[PDB]
């Protein structure tokens, strides 16, 4: 489903964050920005989802910077 699983804004014409494990974990950039600023940063769903293994995935610093802009 192509909309944010937090704010439920459609993501059909823009960019978003896609959890590598859970397909239904889509997040708009504002929602991703709120999770980054609050976390410090794992999956904005809070389920600390893992990589494509079991170690939980986290935003790279360059991804964090892109979202904040």
């Amino acid at each position: 489903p192509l909309c944010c699983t937090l704010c439920h804004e459609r993501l059909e014409d823009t960019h978003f964050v896609q959890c590598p494990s859970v397909p239904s974990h889509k997040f708009c950039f504002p929602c991703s920005r709120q999770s980054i600023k609050q976390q410090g940063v794992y999956c904005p769903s809070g389920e600390k989802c893992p990589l494509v293994s079991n170690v939980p995935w986290a935003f790279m610093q360059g991804e964090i910077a892109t979202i904040l802009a």
Binding site: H15, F16, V17, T66
Partner: peptide, 7 residues
């Protein structure tokens, strides 16, 4: 790993 930022 691929970016979580998608379009």
């Amino acid at each position: 790993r691929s970016s979580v930022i998608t379009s």
